[PDB]
Ligand binder design. Structure first.
Ligand SMILES: CCCCC[C@H](O)CC(=O)O
Ligand SMILES: [Br-]
Lengths: 258, 260
């Protein structure tokens, strides 16, 4: 047994709360774990319209990374959209990261920019079922924020999760500011000497969706991780639908990747 | 007793939000009932920050607005947990006609007689200064502490001691500061009468292992402001919707059928 320090990063609309089952499992196993709320997420004080710049959204993780003690290194886990966040962290504090885990996360790199990963990622969310957007820059300009609907969550996100988790999420999801893919690419700049220096592990956790898996496969090709693992039977929120398997997998990764 | 779709409205306590009722919300929607769980001011994902709502009325407004927008002919089963007891008491006074029956789950239940001032002071004594809870002074030492922040240990020990470990983890990621409202403010905001507030059916649900609000204190309130009935849920810690979801749910449907 070696005490590890896990740092968990949620995806769009979510917050630190979505990892509650994982956090409980890590803590009861004696490990340290930090689940951050990104800007305007969970109980972060900012509202969507107050953080129009991507850096504002990533602020919480970046500040936490900067306060990490000297010797300490962590297992940085990014979920879906959260991959962009941990990517920025890897580039900024490479020495502080033992291993980075992209749980179905947007994993941009030199051969596949944030514009490609985000355009496709948002592809399966925008204009889906009961989702809806706002227009702060006039109804004539691109949408300002994206709000996830109850139906969308039930049928596309939590479809393989306990019903109470859908209910939990329905009461907690918050709007996502629609950051410009350009703003994003200027914010997330990766180099081989830093980002590329961090051990990287990708976890495929997609179910009954070829196109989506083809997307994940595409990213893996363009920006080859150190390892690819897989979890089966998961919906979009693995920490909700396959908690024990995810925990087991993260523990394994933390143990072998010193 | 035949199943008849009703509308349950859940009101959380200090530091919490609609999120704490997730297991109950799921059970109710599963059974075919309507349920609405609200975030009071600066609670859960409500936009306001504690310091921005120093007046109790701004804490209670999400509830008051919801009640007012309630289609004139529908009634609801209003459930308030602990501090949430004051919020529902207010709604019962303002919208008695719209409440089929009110349920106080370990809830502060001041009557037309015993003022919240008295109860609020007792409730405070059970949280303020407990374990790792702390206060703030955004207005200087010359003035009263401005907010109250629940500590991880206070939660684990006095509130979630009989709940699944994952629920304590969820709470430590969601609990928010509570503005320290003055009893004078609350007392003027929560004016109850036997004419309005008194006309609504009331049930109190006791949590036998409640280490947050002691049985002694809970007992007295029932003494001073007799409810139409009192039920108990054994093995329940303070967060009954956490430690004993199924029993709380069944008890709620039972109350609903009785005071239809
Ligand atoms: C417009 C950006 C949409 C990002 C969607 C995420 O990648 C997937 C999700 O978590 O729903
Ligand atoms: Br309380």
């Amino acid at each position: 047994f070696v005490k590890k320090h896990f740092v968990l990063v949620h995806t769009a609309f979510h917050g630190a709360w979505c990892w509650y089952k994982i956090v409980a499992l890590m803590r009861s196993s004696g490990h340290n774990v930090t689940a951050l709320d990104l800007g305007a997420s969970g109980i972060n004080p900012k509202q969507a319209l107050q953080i129009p710049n991507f850096s504002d959204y990533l602020s919480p993780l970046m500040e936490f990374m900067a306060s990490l003690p000297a010797n300490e290194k962590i297992i940085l886990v990014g979920h879906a959209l959260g991959g962009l966040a941990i990517s920025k962290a890897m580039e900024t504090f490479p020495e502080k990261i033992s291993v980075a885990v992209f749980l179905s996360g947007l994993m941009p790199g030199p051969n596949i920019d944030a514009t490609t990963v985000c355009t496709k990622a948002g592809s399966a969310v925008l204009g889906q079922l009961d989702n809806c957007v706002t227009y702060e820059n006039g109804p004539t300009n691109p949408p300002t924020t994206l709000i996830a609907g109850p139906k969308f969550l039930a049928t596309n996100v939590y479809h393989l999760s306990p019903i109470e988790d859908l209910a939990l999420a329905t009461a907690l999801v918050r709007p996502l500011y629609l950051y410009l893919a350009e703003d994003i690419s200027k914010e997330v700049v990766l180099s081989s000497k830093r980002y590329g220096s961090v051990k990287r592990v990708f976890i495929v956790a997609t179910e009954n969706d070829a196109l989506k898996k083809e997307f994940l496969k595409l990213m893996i090709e363009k920006n080859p991780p150190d390892e690819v693992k897989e979890i089966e039977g998961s919906d979009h929120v693995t920490m909700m639908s396959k908690p024990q398997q995810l925990f087991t997998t993260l523990l394994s990764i933390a143990n072998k990747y010193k």
